[PDB]
Amino acid sequence: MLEYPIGTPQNLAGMEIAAVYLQPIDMEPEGHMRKASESDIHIEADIHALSNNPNGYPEGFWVPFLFIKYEITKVGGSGAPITGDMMAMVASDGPHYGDNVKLQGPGKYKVKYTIYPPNAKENPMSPYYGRHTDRETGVRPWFKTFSVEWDFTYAGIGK
Amino acid sequence: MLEYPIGTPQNLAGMEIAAVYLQPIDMEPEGHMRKASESDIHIEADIHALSNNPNGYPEGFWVPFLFIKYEITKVGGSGAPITGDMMAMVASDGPHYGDNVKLQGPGKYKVKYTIYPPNAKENPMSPYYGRHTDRETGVRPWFKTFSVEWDFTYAGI
Numbered sequence: 001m002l003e004y005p006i007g008t009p010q011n012l013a014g015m016e017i018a019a020v021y022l023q024p025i026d027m028e029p030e031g032h033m034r035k036a037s038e039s040d041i042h043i044e045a046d047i048h049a050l051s052n053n054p055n056g057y058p059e060g061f062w063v064p065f066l067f068i069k070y071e072i073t074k075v076g077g078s079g080a081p082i083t084g085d086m087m088a089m090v091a092s093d094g095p096h097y098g099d100n101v102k103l104q105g106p107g108k109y110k111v112k113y114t115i116y117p118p119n120a121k122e123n124p125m126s127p128y129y130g131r132h133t134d135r136e137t138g139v140r141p142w143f144k145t146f147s148v149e150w151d152f153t154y155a156g157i158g159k
Numbered sequence: 160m161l162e163y164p165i166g167t168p169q170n171l172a173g174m175e176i177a178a179v180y181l182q183p184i185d186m187e188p189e190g191h192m193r194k195a196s197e198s199d200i201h202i203e204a205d206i207h208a209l210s211n212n213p214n215g216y217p218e219g220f221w222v223p224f225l226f227i228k229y230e231i232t233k234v235g236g237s238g239a240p241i242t243g244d245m246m247a248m249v250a251s252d253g254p255h256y257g258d259n260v261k262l263q264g265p266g267k268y269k270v271k272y273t274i275y276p277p278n279a280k281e282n283p284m285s286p287y288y289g290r291h292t293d294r295e296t297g298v299r300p301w302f303k304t305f306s307v308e309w310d311f312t313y314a315g316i
């Protein structure tokens with residue numbers, strides 16, 4: 001099956017941030033993702049460490065415990081922006097942040113991700129992840145919440 | 160970076176499970192780890208995917224969202240077992256599960272880890288992680304909770 005790129009990856013705070021979409025998926029636990037039959041796509045945020053990542057991740061590692069909010073808007077057209085929170089999950093090609101999304105038909109869409117670090121008050125995983133701070137094994141502070149945007153042309157499941 | 164081994168790694172459920180320890184650490188958020196000055200070691204569970212991991216992890220990837228309990232027993236042995244829950248955290252060499260621990264002096268110890276998958280009701284990370292189940296991108300079910308044990312000799316510091 002086809003995985004569609006959403007623009008080109010952007011590099012910030014020692015991380016590569018990429019956006020992709022595919023057909024809606026099914027996930028355990030059930031009842032968290034919007035039903036696949038009631039969705040158009042499964043949108044994903046692919047976040048991996050660059051070389052010399054300041055938070056201690058080896059190059060290519062998945063960056064875990066982040067919280068991602070998205071806003072998808074049909075470019076210059078009728079309809080409200082489509083918003084939601086991604087969920088961390090694993091697939092046959094590894095761990096991703098993603099969500100099943102219902103769109104507003106074929107056309108151009110803006111896609112914006114707002115990426116929250118593990119220590120952000122909005123991130124629900126903040127009580128469950130730490131960062132070493134001692135001189136010997138410590139790392140630099142977490143990045144501050146930031147956004148990245150792209151656009152893509154949605155045509156459906158016409159493959 | 161210098162760490163000390165606790166026995167040798169064990170391969171189970173498509174994962175390499177290793178136990179290591181180093182000097183006590185400091186962590187953000189503060190006040191969660193036992194104070195470094197009140198600890199002897201920082202104990203770690205190093206868990207990485209093997210080749211053909213059944214849950215979709217590429218070989219060498221850190222296995223995230225696990226919940227790990229530990230029990231450390233001094234072989235003879237007048238003290239109570241040392242117990243705790245590890246916390247996931249990142250250090251200059253990458254992410255680990257770890258905890259600051261106060262031991263019961265030099266000697267031989269048994270170390271047992273109980274590893275909970277990310278869908279276990281006992282695991283507080285379970286509400287935050289999922290697994291694709293569709294034919295095209297899906298993975299095999301999570302492993303069942305299991306334990307691993309090692310012996311090691313502690314001499315300080």
Ligand code: NA
Nearest residue numbers: 007151152153
């Ligand atoms: Na496009």
Ligand code: NA
Nearest residue numbers: 186187188189
């Ligand atoms: Na703090």
Ligand code: NI
Nearest residue numbers: 044089096098
């Ligand atoms: Ni996904």
